[PDB]
Scaffold this active site. Structure first.
Site, short mmCIF file in Angstrom:
data_model
loop_
_atom_site.label_atom_id
_atom_site.label_comp_id
_atom_site.label_asym_id
_atom_site.label_seq_id
_atom_site.Cartn_x
_atom_site.Cartn_y
_atom_site.Cartn_z
N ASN A 1 0.83 -1.22 0.00
CA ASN A 1 0.00 0.00 0.00
C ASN A 1 0.87 1.27 0.00
O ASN A 1 1.43 1.65 1.04
CB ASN A 1 -0.95 -0.01 1.23
CG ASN A 1 -1.91 1.18 1.27
OD1 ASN A 1 -1.97 1.98 0.33
ND2 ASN A 1 -2.68 1.29 2.36
N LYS B 1 -0.04 4.37 -0.33
CA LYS B 1 -0.76 5.53 0.26
C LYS B 1 -0.59 6.80 -0.62
O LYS B 1 -0.49 6.66 -1.83
CB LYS B 1 -0.35 5.72 1.73
CG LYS B 1 -0.53 4.46 2.59
CD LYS B 1 -0.37 4.75 4.09
CE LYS B 1 -0.70 3.53 4.95
NZ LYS B 1 -0.45 3.75 6.40
N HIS C 1 -9.89 0.57 4.77
CA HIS C 1 -8.61 0.92 5.41
C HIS C 1 -8.83 1.86 6.59
O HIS C 1 -9.71 2.72 6.55
CB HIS C 1 -7.62 1.55 4.41
CG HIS C 1 -6.21 1.64 4.93
ND1 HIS C 1 -5.82 2.56 5.88
CD2 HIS C 1 -5.12 0.87 4.68
CE1 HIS C 1 -4.55 2.37 6.19
NE2 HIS C 1 -4.10 1.36 5.47
N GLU D 1 -7.40 4.52 7.68
CA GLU D 1 -7.38 5.95 7.35
C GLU D 1 -8.69 6.41 6.70
O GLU D 1 -9.12 7.53 6.93
CB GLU D 1 -6.16 6.30 6.49
CG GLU D 1 -4.84 6.36 7.25
CD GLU D 1 -3.65 5.80 6.47
OE1 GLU D 1 -3.65 5.82 5.22
OE2 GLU D 1 -2.70 5.33 7.12
N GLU E 1 -5.48 -4.99 10.69
CA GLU E 1 -4.63 -3.84 11.05
C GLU E 1 -4.74 -3.52 12.55
O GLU E 1 -5.81 -3.15 13.02
CB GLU E 1 -5.12 -2.57 10.35
CG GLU E 1 -4.97 -2.48 8.85
CD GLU E 1 -5.50 -1.15 8.35
OE1 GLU E 1 -4.73 -0.17 8.33
OE2 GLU E 1 -6.70 -1.07 8.02
N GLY F 1 2.88 5.23 20.25
CA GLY F 1 4.12 4.52 19.98
C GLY F 1 4.23 3.20 20.73
O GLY F 1 4.92 3.12 21.74
N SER G 1 2.79 -3.17 11.37
CA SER G 1 4.11 -2.74 10.89
C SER G 1 4.95 -3.92 10.38
O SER G 1 5.37 -4.77 11.17
CB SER G 1 4.87 -1.99 12.00
OG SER G 1 6.28 -2.10 11.84
#
Lengths: 239, 243
Positions: free
Chosen positions: B8, B10, B92, B94, B162, B168, B206
């Site tokens: 992907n 993006k 997705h 986003e 996902e 973090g 990730s």
């Protein structure tokens, strides 16, 4: 010195390579007024194809973009990408973006500033819904959307304002006259005199001439008719 | 179940830089047992299909739920097939959380894309606040249900998990396996034995060249949807994760 007449054609979510190639062939071969600035708005997936096939005198516009050059925004495109394939315009704040997909005044204002800093021209759209006209607040609503754009314009030379009623020529003229008076008090007399304001309601070959004769109407943003041969007649509305 | 790796891109690239990336992929040694697909920005989809080797697939990053109409700024499955691409990515994180796309809308999109003859990479995943409240299972089963209600033939679908919460924080390979195994148990019963055994479930957290080999050894992980590393030369190593 006087304002040059401007006609854009918004294809929306329509076309394939075969049908759009046929449309482009017709525009390239037609007799178009030398005193009209013409621009075609293509689906993102066909922007490169359209710029490759259209005559250089005719501009190409994206139908939407985002507000930074790159990043984690799956499904979006940027002004850098639009320049990269050779288009010079973008349409921002269209009623379908605002009302089907929920884009705010604040977001649209940010998109406007970024597109202009990156060296694109902007067709900035404003307009009132049916419930808003019925309540008598046409002016308050469009002044509000216009201020959110103007607070983000440092130079008006590459901006065109488009008025769409989301729902006659004399009613259009009344809104255009008041919008120019807004530019006069809240910006300057010079900006008011030089800025094109185009009409984005329903435009056909039958109504384009009377609309174009109004003192404060500088052209059009055309919808469904931009996919047909009568688009040529609308470009030539003043002759 | 054939190993599957999507990349992907993006909102990144121009004609120069994406051209260089595609050239690298065309010239690399890629495992014959991996199904590879590249997801490009809409403005570069035709370009990408012209330049990529035919063994590699091309995917749109989004689409709408009818073939044509008054939706300024959108594209359809008919347009994607027209330029020769065979896949679309839908739901997705986003799209859901920056642009506000609902489960109902995503489900309508899945039904239209499959009826029109595309394959679909359908994405699900829980946010950080949802992970902290202990409701990971409830969230992904709800998202998976809204997809499955709209699928008739599962041979053309790939499911992507996902962990939005970590991206973090860090997600381990055992943690990924635990979610994948539950998703497969859901399919066995809400669809069939045959569909659970045959459907690919890929990991979309990730993924780098450093962590891909341990992730790919898990019993219920069938491949990956890769983010930022899909733009670098190490994408080749991820495709070859089982060697």
């Amino acid at each position: 010195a006087p304002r040059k007449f401007f006609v854009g054609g918004n294809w929306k979510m329509n076309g394939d390579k075969k049908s759009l190639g046929e449309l482009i062939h017709t525009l390239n071969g037609a007799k178009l007024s030398a005193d009209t600035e013409v621009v075609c708005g293509a689906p993102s997936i066909y922007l490169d194809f359209a710029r490759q096939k259209l005559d250089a005198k005719i501009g190409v516009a994206a139908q939407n973009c985002y507000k930074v050059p790159k990043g984690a925004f799956t499904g979006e495109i940027s002004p850098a990408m639009i320049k990269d394939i050779g288009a010079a315009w973008v349409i921002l704040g269209h009623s379908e973006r605002r009302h089907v997909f929920g884009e705010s005044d604040e977001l649209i204002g940010q998109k406007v500033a970024h597109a202009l800093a990156e060296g694109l021209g902007v067709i900035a759209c404003i307009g009132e819904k049916l419930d808003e006209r019925e309540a008598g607040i046409t002016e308050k609503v469009v002044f509000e959307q216009t201020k959110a754009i103007a607070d983000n314009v440092k130079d008006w030379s590459k901006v065109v304002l488009a008025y769409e009623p989301v729902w006659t020529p004399q009613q259009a003229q009344e809104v255009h006259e008041k919008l120019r008076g807004w530019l006069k008090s809240h910006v300057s007399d010079a900006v008011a005199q030089s800025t094109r304001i185009i009409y984005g309601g329903s435009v056909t070959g039958g109504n384009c001439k009377e609309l174009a004769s109004q003192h404060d109407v500088d052209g059009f943003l055309v919808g469904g008719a931009s996919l047909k041969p009568e688009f040529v007649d609308i470009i030539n509305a003043k002759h």
